[PDB]
Write a protein that holds these residues in place. Structure first.
Motif, PDB file in Angstrom:
ATOM      1  N   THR B 172       0.790  -1.231   0.000  1.00  0.00           N
ATOM      2  CA  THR B 172       0.000   0.000   0.000  1.00  0.00           C
ATOM      3  C   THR B 172       0.828   1.291   0.000  1.00  0.00           C
ATOM      4  O   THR B 172       1.733   1.461   0.820  1.00  0.00           O
ATOM      5  N   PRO B 173       0.476   2.205  -0.887  1.00  0.00           N
ATOM      6  CA  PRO B 173       1.193   3.472  -0.973  1.00  0.00           C
ATOM      7  C   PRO B 173       0.932   4.192   0.333  1.00  0.00           C
ATOM      8  O   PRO B 173       0.028   3.807   1.077  1.00  0.00           O
ATOM      9  N   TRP B 174       1.712   5.224   0.632  1.00  0.00           N
ATOM     10  CA  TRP B 174       1.550   5.944   1.888  1.00  0.00           C
ATOM     11  C   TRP B 174       0.101   6.392   1.926  1.00  0.00           C
ATOM     12  O   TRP B 174      -0.512   6.481   2.990  1.00  0.00           O
ATOM     13  N   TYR B 175      -0.440   6.661   0.745  1.00  0.00           N
ATOM     14  CA  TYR B 175      -1.826   7.059   0.644  1.00  0.00           C
ATOM     15  C   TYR B 175      -2.586   5.766   0.612  1.00  0.00           C
ATOM     16  O   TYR B 175      -3.289   5.455  -0.331  1.00  0.00           O
ATOM     17  N   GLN B 176      -2.428   5.035   1.708  1.00  0.00           N
ATOM     18  CA  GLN B 176      -3.016   3.720   1.941  1.00  0.00           C
ATOM     19  C   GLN B 176      -4.400   3.465   1.356  1.00  0.00           C
ATOM     20  O   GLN B 176      -4.518   3.271   0.107  1.00  0.00           O
TER      21      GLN B 176
END
Ligand SMILES: CCCCCCCC(=O)OC[C@H](COP(=O)(O)O[C@@H]1[C@H](O)[C@H](O)[C@@H](OP(=O)(O)O)[C@H](OP(=O)(O)O)[C@H]1O)OC(=O)CCCCCCC
Ligand SMILES: CCCCCCCC(=O)OC[C@H](COP(=O)(O)O[C@@H]1[C@H](O)[C@H](O)[C@@H](OP(=O)(O)O)[C@H](OP(=O)(O)O)[C@H]1O)OC(=O)CCCCCCC
Lengths: 175, 176
Positions: B172-176
């Motif tokens: 998952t990207p930091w922008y979960q």
């Protein structure tokens, strides 16, 4: 009697066929293209030769590069004097790849020579260095062959009197 | 900072982007692709670097080739397992180009390393040897990236269980 590579020999013959159709007298390309097809053939036997001749292989590559620099120089001189625009573009396109192909030929010839003398190479490296050299030799012979034909086409439509002169005269019969 | 060969680094980043979309646990192919992108980024520094690094350049290409052999080997089992038409063939074709490209990478890296800084090689031969190495690195990064994408696409369809263990889990990207 010495083993000779089929691709190196065939690519050399390809250029030879086209270059011997014309006289070298007054033709910069014929003298150089003829000279290149001869070396390329020497090249065919050298890649199959042993380590001592590795230095021989290196020079041949160097000589092929020197002769191909003359071909490009002159091909550009013909184009810079051609009235027809479309043809000149194709002549400049096909010839400008020769420096790149030639220098690549010197690199790949040095790698093959170093590998032969040196011990322990993976047949993978050996066979891949050979394949790269042959593909490069084929590309060079084809590029010079295509360049010779275009340099003739660009001599039909000359830009000005005098300037650059390039003599295209078919091969006189022995008689 | 240190000079770097930008097109090699860009090719490395291209593969890195694809490989970091997934977890390395349970998917060695992924571990190898990540390792390859890291080594390729190191390669862009080395190739632009001086003579103290000639041995390093040869070893880094050897490591890239070793990691690409693991990619090729794994892609194959998966390729055979998939029952798919229009994707399995593509996968095999893509991962059979890789050993050729990586053996060529070993050849071209050996040429550059011995030769750099010598004064016995023209600047033309030097620049042309660099451009050959660059083109080869781009081709390799692209081939592995395409192999990662297709290996995941092929995993969707398997004939039977316990054949090979492959795990495809998104990160998952930091922008979960
Ligand atoms: O009839 P025509 O005079 O057109 O025949 C062509 C003419 O002889 C050209 O000079 C040849 O090539 P180049 O144009 O002089 O090279 C060409 O050979 P190829 O290469 O077409 O057989 C001949 O076909
Ligand atoms: O039938 C199958 C069809 C799938 O088609 P679908 O258009 O959903 O394909 C995805 C789409 O191309 C995404 O843009 C890709 O992600 P990204 O652009 O790289 O983020 C994704 O790649 P990967 O995420 O699988 O690698 C593709 O699977 O539905």
């Amino acid at each position: 009697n010495q083993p000779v590579n089929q691709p190196i020999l065939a690519a050399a013959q390809s250029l030879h066929r086209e270059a011997t159709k014309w006289s070298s007298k007054g033709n910069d390309i014929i003298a150089a293209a003829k000279r290149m097809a001869l070396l390329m053939a020497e090249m065919s036997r050298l890649v199959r030769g042993g380590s001592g001749t590795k230095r021989a292989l290196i020079q041949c590559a160097k000589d092929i590069a020197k002769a191909s620099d003359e071909v490009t120089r002159l091909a550009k001189e013909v184009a810079k004097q051609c009235t027809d625009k479309r043809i000149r573009t194709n002549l400049l396109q096909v010839c400008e790849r020769i420096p790149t192909i030639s220098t690549q030929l010197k690199i790949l010839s040095t790698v093959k020579a170093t590998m032969l003398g040196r011990t322990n190479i993976s047949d993978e490296e050996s066979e891949q260095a050979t394949e790269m050299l042959v593909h490069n030799a084929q590309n060079l012979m084809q590029s010079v062959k295509e360049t010779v034909r275009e340099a003739e086409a660009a001599s039909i439509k000359i830009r000005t009197d005098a300037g650059f002169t390039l003599r295209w005269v078919r091969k006189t019969p022995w008689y």
